[PDB]
Every structure is written in structure tokens, then in C-alpha cells.
A paper describes a structure:
Multifunctional autoprocessing repeats-in-toxin (MARTX) toxins, secreted by multiple Gram-negative bacteria, are primary virulence factors that promote initial colonization, dissemination, and lethality in a wide range of hosts, including humans. By doing this, the clinical strain V. vulnificus MO6-24/O generates a MARTX toxin (MARTXVv) containing four effectors, which are arranged in the following order: domain of unknown function in the first position (DUF1), the Rho inactivation domain (RID), the α/β hydrolase domain (ABH), and a Makes caterpillars floppy-like effector (MCF) with a cysteine protease domain (CPD). Previously, we reported that DUF1 and RID within MARTXVv are not uncoupled by activated CPD in host cells; rather, they are discharged as a duet (it is assumed that the DUF1-RID effector module acts as a functional unit). The data show that DUF1 acts as a RID-dependent transforming NADase domain (RDTND) that disrupts NAD+ homeostasis by hijacking calmodulin.
Numbering used by the authors:
A (entry chain B): 4 to 148
B (entry chain A): 1967 to 2371
The structure:
């Protein structure tokens, strides 16, 4: 299922995290490595994944093992949709357009390490019209660029 | 100077910022987020009845208000409340302070200002009390006298509404609606007030994850966030797991980030897509009621993920607490939010190359826990990573992959 572009990226990321040059990371570094490649499992999914791959009990993950677990992950998730869904929750009347102030509340709350400026401009180009209303479909397709 | 007016202004700045889009703030009226304002004109007819009841409460309750002010304070309360006077409710709090009501957490520097928007608060309070090794004791909003006494007067108004206006009379119900909304925003304002007392790392008790629109979402977290981007608050530790899964654990990692994936999101059926509420009659017509909480299959973490992609080196902020930003001769690494003087440097051959930014981002991820661990100067040149602290070393060699020394 995995392309040449991906395995090579995974390979680079993996090898930086394997620090003793033997070609294995530990159990606890997995989620870190994965999240650095744009795949965030739950604590649960990251236990299932860990208990399966660590059936021998040596807390060892090959690149091959890593390649396997990352293939299964990505089969499952749709990033693009999952964000658009998340913004939908804030459309009380449907119609695809949530308020510009609401969008300020979302981002300041879910913007874990954002800053007031970084927020402020988000809202500015959130929607370039003088209306409160902001397109949330537009917003993601803008940030996904 | 009063401490409360200190945090009150903080709170006001926050509120004004959130109002930049809606621009309803008339700087004699500062709006509380998610609390609608409901003015009602029943003149001084009703006002003097109310104030005298409130006056009587204060006077005939055992409290730290001197009884000369029994009615002066009663006036200031109902007046700050019903008229949504920012200035007057700050004064009210200041007057409480002046009587010996602290709006400060009780246990000085050992106070872990914590927040509890939950059901089985009983069990959590002490699993957290118990896990504290430092001699530091968790405190909640109920634990601070000034906030407590403020809510007490605020309840009296509420009761007076239910007890002196019965809502069958049409204009009578309108004053009660006003009272409710007015007294409700007091509790909102006072909540932000309490949140600004947050320092270092904070626990949020929130069994079953996040509830969109709750006092946390509206008036607690945004204050905590502002406190965070001023470098005053560290981690916000949400406890959504059943209290069972926080035993055999240190204070270190009790609670996780609401941004962390597999955090529950729930919303009230009341005003949760009212026409779509009806649509949600399919499984059970009388399954979802106004007060019912609906769990949602959305991921707040998906928002934080998006952020990572939009903002260069964002992922270093969250997982490492490193703000690197576009520099002059290279990249500047600071400890987030990059407010303290200290800074180190990052230099790449082609800084505009997104591929090379990820290499050193991953690099840093794998090598350094914090800002204090990093060499003063770090270089990515010709697929080798070099570090100058006080001598010079090279440690990255990318022959299709990363080997060290
Ligand atoms: Ca190894
Ligand atoms: Ca193994
Ligand atoms: Ca809408
Ligand atoms: Ca717009």
C-alpha cells in the first residue's frame, strides 16, 4: 500500500529516532515518531499497536515493524474530512458558515501553542469580506495549502 | 492596590479581544463570552424592593460585612448585575476584598489552582490531593472566600426572582428572565477572575472529556490560554478518564491535553442544532431531551493537527515547548512563548526548503526534551547536522538515513 516517497520519509524520521544505530526504536518512542509523520493515534490505539508489535516483550520495533503499523494506521484515517467535521460542530444553523468570533473562540481554545497575533490574522483571512460569517470549508482548504 | 481589580482588568482585556469581531463592547459594558445580555426596564419601582431584601440578607447573615454597609453593598450588587456595569462589579469585588474576602487561592505558593466542571467531583478532589508529593495542595473555586461570598449574594437575587415574580404574568416573567441572565453573567465574569489566578501546571476535572459551551469552554480555558501565552501557566492537565486510571501515578502525568487525540466532545441537546435535534428522533424520539448531553464523533485534535501543517515548526511548540521563528542569519529557537530573553540559533543551507525544515524539526524532536538542552548554535549543511556549544561537533550524516557520531 506504501509508496516510495513515504517509506523513504518514514525511513529518515525512523533513523533519527533510532539513536544507537541498531535499527530499532523503543516502545515509548513510537507515538512520537508517528505524530512527527502526521498520524496521531489515541492512547488506546497506541496500546493495541504496542501490545501486538511487542508480543515478545523486548520492547523492540524494527523499521519493518514500523512500516507495517504505519500502513494499517493511514488505511483508517481521513485527515481532510476529520478537520472539516471538527469545524462542523460549530455550525448551529448548518449552512457551512460559522461566525468569525466563534472561529476566534475555537482557535484560541484549540490553539494549544498559538499566540494572540497568530489568532488575529487567522480571523482576518478567515474571510476577507466585512461580514462576521466565515466559511469553514474555505478556511481548511486555505490552511491545507 | 486590590488583587481582584488586577485580574479583573486582565479579564477585561481578554473579553475585549474576543469582542474585536462582534465589537459590542462599549467600554462601560464588557461582554462575557457565551452569556447573552438581557436588559429589562422595571425602573426603581422593583429595584428598591430587591435592594432592601438583599440588604436584609447581608444584615441577618453571619458574614464579614459591617452592617452600616449592609444596604450600600446590596445597592452596588443589584446595580452592577442588572445594569451590566463592568466598572460597578469590579468595585463590588474590590469592596468584598476590602472586608477580608480574598479572591486568592488559600495555600499561598503551594496552591495548584484547579478547575472542576464535573459530576463525581468527590472522588477526583482527593485522588489529586493524594498524589501531591511536593506538599502542594490543589484548590478549586469553592475554596476561595471572595468568589464564594459573591456567588452567595448572586443566588439571593436569583431566588428573589423565582419567589417574587411568578412567570404566568407576562411582564413579570420578563424581569425574571433578565435577572437570570444578569446573575448568570456574574458567575461567568467571576469564573474568568478565578482562572487568572492560575499559575504553573493546572488540573481540569472533566469526566468524559470536553463539553462545548460549558464554563470551561467559555470563560475558563480562554483565560488559561492567555495566561499560557504570557508564560504564567504551563501544562493544563485534563482528567477525562474514570478516576481509577489516575492511581499508581505521580502528579507529573495525571491528566492529559484536551488537544490530545481520543478526547471526548459532548454538547447539550438544548440549542444543539434545534431543527437537527428533531432529526435525532430516529433512534429514540424521547431519547434526547433539552438537558441531554450528546457525545460527538469529532476530534479537537484534528484542529491541532491542521495547525501543525499550516504553521512551520508548530509541532516543536506542543511536544517540546520550543518557539522557533524566521530569523536574520538563520532560525531563532526560544523557550515558548519566547518572552524570556534567552535564544539559540538554527542554520540551514536552504532555509526556504520545507523538506530541510522537517529534517531538523524531526532532528530536534528526537534529540532535545527542552530548550535548555540545545546547543547555542545548530547547523544543517550538506546532509550533516553540526552543533557549536563551546567546541564544535558534527552528528548527522544522511546516507539515505540518519546515523550518529
Ligand atoms: Ca536502537
Ligand atoms: Ca521486538
Ligand atoms: Ca451557520
Ligand atoms: Ca466573510
Amino acid at each position: 500500500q506504501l509508496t516510495e516517497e513515504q517509506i523513504a520519509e518514514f525511513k529518515e524520521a525512523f533513523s533519527l529516532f533510532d539513536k544507537d544505530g541498531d535499527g530499532t526504536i523503543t516502545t515509548k518512542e513510537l507515538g512520537t515518531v508517528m505524530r512527527s509523520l502526521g498520524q496521531n493515534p489515541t492512547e488506546a490505539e497506541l496500546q493495541d499497536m504496542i501490545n501486538e508489535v511487542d508480543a515478545d516483550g523486548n520492547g523492540t520495533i524494527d523499521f519493518p515493524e514500523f512500516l507495517t503499523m504505519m500502513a494499517r494506521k493511514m488505511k483508517d484515517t481521513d485527515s481532510e474530512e476529520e478537520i472539516r467535521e471538527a469545524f462542523r460542530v460549530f455550525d448551529k444553523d448548518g449552512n457551512g458558515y460559522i461566525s468569525a468570533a466563534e472561529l476566534r473562540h475555537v482557535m484560541t481554545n484549540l490553539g494549544e501553542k498559538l499566540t494572540d497575533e497568530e489568532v488575529d490574522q487567522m480571523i482576518r483571512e478567515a474571510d476577507i469580506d466585512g461580514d462576521g460569517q466565515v466559511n469553514y470549508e474555505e478556511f481548511v482548504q486555505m490552511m491545507t495549502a | 492596590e486590590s488583587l481582584v481589580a488586577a485580574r479583573a482588568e486582565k479579564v477585561a482585556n481578554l473579553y475585549r479581544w474576543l469582542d474585536t469581531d462582534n465589537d459590542v463592547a462599549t467600554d462601560k459594558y464588557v461582554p462575557v463570552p457565551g452569556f447573552e445580555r438581557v436588559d429589562v426596564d422595571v425602573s426603581d419601582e422593583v429595584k428598591q424592593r430587591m435592594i432592601q431584601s438583599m440588604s436584609g440578607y447581608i444584615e441577618h447573615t453571619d458574614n464579614q460585612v459591617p452592617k452600616d454597609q449592609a444596604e450600600a453593598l446590596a445597592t452596588l450588587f443589584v446595580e452592577s448585575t442588572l445594569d451590566y456595569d463592568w466598572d460597578k462589579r469590579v468595585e463590588f469585588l474590590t469592596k468584598l476584598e476590602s472586608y477580608g474576602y480574598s479572591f486568592e487561592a488559600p495555600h499561598a505558593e503551594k496552591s495548584i489552582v484547579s478547575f472542576w466542571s464535573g459530576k463525581n467531583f468527590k472522588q477526583y478532589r482527593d485522588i489529586l490531593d493524594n498524589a501531591q508529593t511536593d506538599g502542594k495542595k490543589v484548590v478549586y473555586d469553592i475554596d476561595v472566600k471572595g468568589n464564594a461570598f459573591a456567588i452567595d449574594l448572586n443566588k439571593h437575587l436569583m431566588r428573589w426572582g423565582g419567589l417574587f415574580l411568578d412567570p404566568d404574568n407576562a411582564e413579570q416573567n420578563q424581569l425574571k428572565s433578565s435577572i437570570d441572565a444578569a446573575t448568570f453573567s456574574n458567575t461567568g465574569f467571576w469564573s474568568s477572575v478565578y482562572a487568572t489566578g492560575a499559575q504553573n501546571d493546572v488540573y481540569v476535572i472533566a469526566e468524559g472529556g470536553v463539553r462545548l459551551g460549558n464554563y470551561f469552554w467559555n470563560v475558563e480555558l480562554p483565560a488559561l490560554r492567555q495566561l499560557q501565552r504570557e508564560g504564567l501557566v504551563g501544562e493544563i492537565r485534563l482528567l477525562d478518564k474514570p478516576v481509577s486510571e489516575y492511581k499508581d501515578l505521580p502528579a507529573d502525568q495525571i491528566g492529559r491535553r484536551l488537544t490530545d487525540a481520543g478526547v471526548a466532545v459532548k454538547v447539550r441537546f438544548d440549542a444543539l442544532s434545534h431543527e437537527r435535534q428533531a432529526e435525532l428522533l430516529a433512534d429514540n424520539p424521547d431519547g434526547y431531551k433539552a438537558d441531554t448531553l450528546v457525545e460527538l464523533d469529532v476530534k479537537l485534535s484534528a484542529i491541532d493537527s491542521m495547525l501543525r501543517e499550516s504553521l512551520p515548526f508548530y509541532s516543536l511548540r506542543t511536544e517540546r515547548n520550543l518557539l522557533v521563528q524566521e530569523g536574520e542569519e538563520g532560525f531563532e529557537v526560544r523557550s515558548w512563548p519566547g518572552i524570556d530573553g534567552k535564544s539559540k540559533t538554527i542554520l540551514l543551507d536552504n532555509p526556504e526548503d520545507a523538506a530541510q525544515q522537517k529534517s531538523i524539526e524531526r532532528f530536534i524532536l528526537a534529540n532535545f526534551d527542552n530548550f535548555e538542552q540545545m546547543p547555542d548554535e545548530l547547523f544543517l549543511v550538506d546532509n550533516k547536522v553540526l552543533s557549536h556549544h563551546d567546541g564544535r561537533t558534527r552528528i548527522i550524516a544522511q546516507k539515505e538515513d540518519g546515523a550518529w557520531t
